[PDB]
Chains A and B, each alone.
With several copies, the nearest count.
Chain A
Amino acid sequence: VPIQKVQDDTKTLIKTIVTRINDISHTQSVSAKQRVTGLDFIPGLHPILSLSKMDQTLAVYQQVLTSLPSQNVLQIANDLENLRDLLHLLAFSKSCSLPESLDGVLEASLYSTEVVALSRLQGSLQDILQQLDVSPEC
């Protein structure tokens, strides 16, 4: 398996997800920096540096987007699952291994959950993409 091809497919998948989030009009207008209280469980500006941090961040975003009842978020969650599997395949390269208030915010504020989740996901993916050019540590 050509690792260069895996990295290229990872970059292409990240760009695809970023474009999908860009196409959702009501998400680009929301500032990912402007903090929202009550949604601190959604990885805001954590300095993503390790492979395990990327994996846990994407797993959190996956679990959050799974609860939303839209088909766009379901598709983004599946794409994130593929991205996570690609990250595990990239982790197996450099020979290194990797290891409930949500219900209330989904029931009361679905719009806030979706908007903040998608804005944080877009920011995290742009950071991962920009950091993929530099060889990342395990």
Chain B
Amino acid sequence: DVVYFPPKILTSVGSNASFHCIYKNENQIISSKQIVWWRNLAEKIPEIQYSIVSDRVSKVTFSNLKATRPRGKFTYDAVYCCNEQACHHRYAELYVI
């Protein structure tokens, strides 16, 4: 299971938004250095934007947010907390208007 802090973010263009995540891999929390972030399972977010809040909580910071381009019915971007190559099904909903 994964936990996002916060589960959802609603913001406007140009603002900054940060997501925290906890990755409990098969009953053991992996090191925050092992956690990587993905965007809509399509492209890895540059490691420059990552921030190690603590040994277990990873943080991603978005600067000068661009308006989220809708992909059909999906008007939000799915942010994924992943344990290296292996991602999880649960994602964070990022709304940029």
Contact = CB atoms under 8 A, between A and B. Distances in A.
Contact of A30 (B42, B73, B89, B90): B42
Interface residues of B, number: 16
B87 A34 contact: yes
Given A29-B42, A30-B41, A36-B41, A112 B89 contact: yes
Interface string B32-43: 000000001111
Contacts of B41: 30-31, 34, 36, 112, 115-116
Nearest to B86: A37
Contacts of B27: none
Interface stretch (A1-9, A57-65, A103-111, A122-130): A103-111
B87 A108 contact: no
Given A34-B85, A38-B88, A105-B89, A112 B72 contact: no
A46 interface: no
Contacts of B74: 26, 111
A93 interface: no
Contact of B72 (A36, A37, A72, A116): A72
Interface string A22-50: 00111001110011111100000000000
Contacts of B87: 34, 36-37
Interface string B66-97: 00000111100010000001111111000000
* A-B residue pairs, 3 tightest by C-beta: A26-B71, A38-B89, A29-B42
Interface of A: 24-26, 29-31, 34-39, 70, 72, 105, 108-109, 111-113, 115-116
